[PDB]
Amino acid sequence: KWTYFGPDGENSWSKKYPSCGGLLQSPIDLHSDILQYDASLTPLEFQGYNLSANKQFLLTNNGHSVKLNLPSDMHIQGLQSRYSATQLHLHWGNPNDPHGSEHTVSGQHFAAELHIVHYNSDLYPDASTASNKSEGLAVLAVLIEMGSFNPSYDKIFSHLQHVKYKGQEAFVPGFNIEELLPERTAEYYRYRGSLTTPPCNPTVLWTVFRNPVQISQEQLLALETALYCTHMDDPSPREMINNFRQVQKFDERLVYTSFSQ
Amino acid sequence: KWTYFGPDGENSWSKKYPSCGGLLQSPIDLHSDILQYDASLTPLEFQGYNLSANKQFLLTNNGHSVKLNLPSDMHIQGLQSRYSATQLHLHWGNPNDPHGSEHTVSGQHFAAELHIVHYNSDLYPDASTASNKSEGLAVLAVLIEMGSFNPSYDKIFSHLQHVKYKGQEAFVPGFNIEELLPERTAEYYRYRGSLTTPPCNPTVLWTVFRNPVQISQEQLLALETALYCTHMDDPSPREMINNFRQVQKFDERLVYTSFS
Ligand SMILES: NS(=O)(=O)c1c(F)c(F)c(S(=O)(=O)CCO)c(NC2CCCCCCC2)c1F
Ligand SMILES: NS(=O)(=O)c1c(F)c(F)c(S(=O)(=O)CCO)c(NC2CCCCCCC2)c1F
Ligand SMILES: [Zn+2]
Ligand SMILES: [Zn+2]
């Protein structure tokens, strides 16, 4: 059992999960000193993001986040191997401190962060297997701020109130995930990192888009209040909040940008 | 041992020291949402900070920072118990990313940070005994930014070449420690936290001053380049850099300010 608050909190993850205390840890603060423009950085292409509306995809509160499972036929192109979708999830903060992105940009926490997890399907038979292996994962990160209502994100946020507790499962009608991407996806930060949750394997190529998306005050509140980290039967409920890991040292590492300034 | 890097860096500190994976950990990001003004916070009074120019004080490279020993006559007034000085020390980054303050303000790392450690000498016989007890410590933080040369800080820095390796020591003549403090010291952040290094006891009354000081770029480069974590006879040597902890979750606590 690992949490984001307390003695089983992030500082103690290394105890049972050695990689959490290891190399190439994520997330990071995105700031000019570690940034380098790289003009070999080409736009990604997104394939099979348009999931059938006439089909439904499994949403899961896993006691640590709310995740939507995704079909392996959805993949990205523009990286070295094929990367096929496995899942998306979010991290966020709390109504007292609604700044719970994981990556930060010149020290600024955004409101929340959306992650779309892909695995290496040129090399590995699944995501689980790929996760423990080198260059085995690729994560897309969309920074989220407060602003206008977001009908596309609502396509997820409306099933929340019905997966409130640990282990619970429910169904979203398939939709076009590219709707969850920001403006100018060609402009992004790229670097080598790790899973931000136990077991923290250093196996992730991160792409964090330069531009954020906007969801409204109420959707943001909704996301921050809907879920619990605990089961239905648990005598000591815990609200699912602050489910972002703190930024990590970035020693001898560099973040590559597809954009100049 | 414990380091700021590698498999013995900060995310593994809790495997050696229970408190570093506990509550109320320092340092923290100083940002708008969690600041609460508190008109109750009166200016501290610094007693016995004008050290005798006629006395030498030990400056030690301990493999983690450079620390100057301070006399137990040196104390803070203004708090509920008397707090007496034990030492001061610093934290910093590296020439390639010269942002190594422990506290950040609105997410921004300053160049470096100066810490002046005190223990509660109304309750306890010394610092080490006080290190694990209620209301044990009060630490003063001074945020450091790169800029104008600072004569006073050079009263410490000018000696850096003498404490280059771990276990190495210089002697420093007394000057006024208050000269190290930024202006308007009445203006500060205040919160309950911990030691930023192992054993990380959650026994520190923190006071971070609002205003940064400046040191020159030469002065900061000396601090970033003179010192080593390893002994002189270590020919597999570690540079002393990035000797600061990442900011901690701080999300039931508030930080109180004395200014608006
Ligand atoms: N920010 S993250 O992208 O590194 C991340 C999470 F934050 C996260 F919580 C998870 S998971 O524990 O919720 C479970 C995945 O469905 C994964 N998942 C990865 C690691 C777990 C191995 C199997 C799935 C591969 C991705 C994950 F990748
Ligand atoms: N950031 S800090 O102000 O809490 C701090 C340090 F960063 C630090 F490095 C030290 S250290 O020089 O002694 C090396 C760490 O072992 C102390 N020293 C205090 C805490 C040590 C235990 C009890 C005595 C109080 C001094 C210390 F207090
Ligand atoms: Zn994630
Ligand atoms: Zn310190």
Measured distance CA(B44)–CA(B47) in Å, rounded: 10
A:B CB pairs within 8 Å: 86
The Cα-based distances of A155 to A53, A179, A180, A212 in angstroms read: 11, 10, 10, 18
Find the ligand nearest to B86 CA: 2
Span from the CA of B197 to the centroid of ligand 2 (angstroms): 6
CATH 3.10.20.740 fits B1-260, yes or no: no
| Per-domain boundaries in chain B | 1-260
Token pair of B168, please? 């190495």
State whether B33 and A251 contact (CB < 8 Å): no
CATH 3.10.200.10 fits A1-261, yes or no: yes
State whether B14 and A10 contact (CB < 8 Å): no
Tell me the structure's resolution in angstroms, rounded to a single decimal.
2.0
Q: With a 6 A CB cut-off, is B65 part of the ligand 2 pocket?
A: yes
Extended strands (E) in chain A: 29-30, 35-37, 45-47, 56-61, 66-69, 75-77, 83-92, 104-105, 108-109, 112-120, 137-147, 169-173, 188-193, 204-209, 213-216, 255-257
For A222, half-sphere exposure in the C-beta direction (CA atoms, 13 angstrom radius) is 18
Q: Report the residue of chain B nearest A21, measured CA to CA.
A: B11
How close, in Å, is residue B72 to chain A by CA atoms? 34
Identity of the residue in A5, A93, A107 whose CB atom sits nearest the CB atom of B107: A107
Residue nearest to atom 27 of ligand 1 (CA): A195
Measured distance CA(A214)–CA(B10) in Å, rounded: 34
Measured distance CA(A105)–CA(A28) in Å, rounded: 9
Find the ligand nearest to B199 CA: 2
Can you name the residues that pair with A147 across neighbouring β-strands?
A216
Q: Does residue B64 carry a catalytic annotation?
A: yes
Closest to A29 in 3D by CA, of A250, A257, A253: A250
State whether A97 and B251 contact (CB < 8 Å): yes
Task: Please say whether the beta carbons of A123 and A203 come within 8 A.
Answer: no
Measured distance CA(A40)–CA(B200) in Å, rounded: 45
Helix, strand, or coil (residue B217) = helix
Measured distance CA(A37)–CA(A60) in Å, rounded: 38
Token pair of B67, please? 């620390």
Among B2, B28, B32, B249, which would you mutate to test the A interface (most chain A Cβ atoms within 10 Å of its Cβ)? Answer: B249
Can you name the residues that pair with B205 across neighbouring β-strands?
B138, B192
A111 contact residues in B (CB cutoff 8 A): none
H-type alpha helices, A135-216: 151-157
Q: With a 6 A CB cut-off, is A87 part of the ligand 1 pocket?
A: yes
Could you tell me which residues come within 8 angstroms of residue A175 by beta carbon, excluding any fewer than 6 positions away? A51, A53, A152, A155
Experimental method, per PDB record? X-ray
State whether A4 and B33 contact (CB < 8 Å): no
